[PDB]
């Protein structure tokens, strides 16, 4: 059967032929409660207290107990289980190339990494999830060290020179859609470039970036108060009023694409994709494949990063204190196996339940390549050139850049829009809203005794009235 | 896109690695999440706690 | 008075997110429920449901 399945493309033998041969069969949960499973064929071959001699079925491979997002975790049986849960959550938030034809698609949100790499340390289940073909992450030289204190409490220090060389640089694509619509011939919206002395109620912005069809062109720099679609609706001397589509505030970019077509009912319909290059930043979220989430605390240049005797500076420095309570030992084994993998020139196997791969074997392999067997290296201080007294664990670990940038999260309000009903600030940063000074905050300011600050938050910084 | 080779999909500006399994409704890709339920046609006997019934068969 | 969230906008942030969304199972019991039993990893989930992949919080 294996010799026939080595040539699917020749013999036309397939999995369905393996089912029809009576070799495998589908067992559901209620039938599984009467079967007797061997985890491996090592169980079928047994001696002494064989435990069982009436095995009815055998597992094909136990790593099939895991799903899609848990099958990219290297050494998941060396991690604490909540960390595998957290990585299964954060693998859906990681930047890569989400699909091959992303240039055709105009999705509302899209994040495309510049240089996605396949992991040096993979599971075999990754060959069927197409993670080799649409990878989300970069193999980073990660050092696990306390360096200047800017990686404490789940933070990372990044190499600024690496970031300059394109390390984890990505693109944010945002699409805006608009369409003409006659709400009767009374309204009759139209894509045209607005004129100051013709249209009613502009937003004090410029319209010269628009072309004559009311639409901006690809390749034009845009900012927060910049109009991308000029749409006017006739009022039933200002014959028409402005209902233009604006770019969302504080996010600059370049109009990547403008697409014009007809909708279902035949009106002109435009989708504009705007491209914004996101360079990694202080406060951007990065994660390993082991639930080691964290924001960038600082970025140091290459001459400031600690360096080995070869001049290798880590791309990322993470705190040692992220490991012990978390017990993500698979992170350390992935780093060691990735050092061995990069030195040997092979893609390391981190299939979960594998007795062929062991920490001692990887350590002997690493010692064969002129390194310390436990992954430590003598690192020198970048600032002073002195040897660091401790020897730093360092090597290639696959990191992911998560969708949560700070620039999509930073918000501030002095004054601005208020709600119609209660005349309090609006909701969210998308509408220039205020933050909620809720009930528990009121309780804390009661306990503080700050009566005037409680008053000013709850009366005259929200909704004064007479 | 059924039965089309990867060259045929790339000529249609479709990703061959795209799995399918979703619908396009008003240009939006919608996926039907599978929904759990108790199995039908099977007798299940439970014990309603803090009830006037001690045991309860159900189908 | 009908079930909500059966059809969801397909996640396209990553290929892994798309694959995970297309193979998603949902227990339609209220997320405000404070009983642990439907949320617990049952023994019968071996090889049928991933023991690791589950959301954080109410679900």
């Amino acid at each position: 059967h294996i010799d026939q399945l080595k040539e699917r493309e020749y013999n036309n033998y397939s999995w369905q032929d393996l089912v029809a041969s009576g070799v495998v069969e589908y067992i559901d949960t209620l039938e599984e409660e009467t079967v007797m499973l061997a985890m491996t064929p090592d169980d079928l071959q047994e001696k002494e207290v064989a435990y069982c001699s009436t095995y009815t079925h055998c597992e094909i491979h136990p790593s099939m107990i895991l799903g899609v997002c848990a099958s990219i975790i290297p050494f998941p049986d060396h991690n604490q289980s909540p960390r595998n849960t957290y990585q299964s959550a954060m693998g859906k938030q990681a930047m890569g190339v989400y699909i091959t034809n992303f240039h055709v698609r105009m999705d509302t949100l899209a994040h495309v990494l510049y240089y996605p790499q396949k992991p040096l340390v993979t599971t075999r289940s990754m060959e069927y999830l197409r993670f080799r073909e649409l990878p989300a992450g970069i193999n980073s030289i990660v050092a696990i060290a306390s360096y200047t204190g800017y990686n404490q409490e789940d933070s990372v220090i990044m190499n600024r020179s690496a970031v300059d060389r394109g390390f984890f640089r990505s693109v944010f694509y945002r699409s805006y859609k608009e369409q003409e619509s006659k709400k009767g011939f009374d309204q009759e919206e139209v894509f045209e470039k607005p004129t100051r002395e013709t249209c009613q109620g502009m937003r004090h912005a410029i319209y010269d970036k628009l072309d004559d069809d009311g639409l901006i062109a690809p390749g034009v720099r845009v900012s927060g108060d910049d109009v991308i679609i000029g749409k006017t609706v006739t009022l039933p001397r200002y014959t028409k009023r402005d209902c233009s589509t604006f770019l969302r505030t504080s996010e600059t970019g370049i109009v990547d694409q403008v697409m014009v077509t007809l909708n279902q009912e035949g009106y002109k319909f435009c989708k504009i994709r705007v491209r914004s290059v996101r360079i990694p930043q202080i406060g951007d979220k990065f994660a390993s494949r082991h639930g080691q989430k964290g924001t960038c605390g600082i970025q140091y240049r290459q001459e400031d990063m600690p360096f080995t005797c070869e001049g290798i500076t880590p791309d990322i420095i993470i705190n040692p204190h992220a490991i012990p309570s978390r017990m993500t030992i698979g992170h350390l084994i992935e780093c060691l196996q990735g050092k061995v993998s990069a030195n040997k020139g092979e893609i390391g196997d981190a299939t979960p339940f594998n007795d062929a791969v062991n920490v001692q074997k990887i350590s002997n392999l690493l010692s064969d390549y002129g390194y310390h067997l436990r992954g430590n290296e003598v690192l020198y201080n970048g600032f002073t050139g002195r040897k660091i007294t401790s020897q730093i664990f360092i090597g290639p670990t696959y990191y992911q850049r998560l969708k949560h940038m700070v620039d999509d999260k930073i918000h501030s309000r002095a004054r601005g829009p208020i709600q119609i009903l209660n005349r309090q600030p609006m909701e969210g940063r998308s509408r220039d809203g205020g933050l909620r000074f809720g009930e528990m905050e009121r309780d804390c300011q009661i306990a503080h005794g700050a009566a005037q600050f409680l008053r000013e938050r709850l009366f005259e910084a929200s909704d004064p009235y007479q | 896109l059924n039965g089309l080779t990867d060259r045929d999909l790339c000529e249609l500006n479709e990703c061959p690695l795209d799995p399918g399994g979703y619908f396009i409704i008003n240009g939006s890709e919608k996926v039907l999440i599978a929904q759990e339920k108790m199995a039908t046609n099977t007798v299940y006997v439970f014990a309603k706690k803090d009830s006037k019934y001690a045991y309860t068969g159900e189908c | 008075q009908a079930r909500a969230g059966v059809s969801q906008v397909l996640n396209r942030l990553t290929f892994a997110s798309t694959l995970s969304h297309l193979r998603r199972l949902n227990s339609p019991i209220g997320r405000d429920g404070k009983l642990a039993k439907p949320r617990q990893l049952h023994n019968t989930l071996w090889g049928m449901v991933c023991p690791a992949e589950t959301p954080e919080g109410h679900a």
């Binding site: 059967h1 294996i2 399945l5 080595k6 699917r8 397939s14 999995w15 369905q16 393996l18 495998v24 491996t40 064929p41 090592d42 071959q45 094909i60 491979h61 099939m64 899609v68 075999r124 060959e127 069927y128 999830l129 594998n354 062929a356 | 799995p19 399918g20 399994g21 979703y22 996926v31 039907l32 599978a34 | 694959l19 297309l22 193979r23």
Partner: peptide, 29 residues
């Protein structure tokens, strides 16, 4: 003949590759 223990990892990943060649990942939908 029986698959020996030293060829078992290759054999099992061959049959897993065959399964994912036929069925894929969204076969239930």
């Amino acid at each position: 003949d029986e698959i020996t223990p030293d060829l078992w990892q290759e054999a099992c990943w061959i049959v897993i590759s065959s399964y994912f060649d036929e069925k894929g990942l969204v076969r239930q939908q």
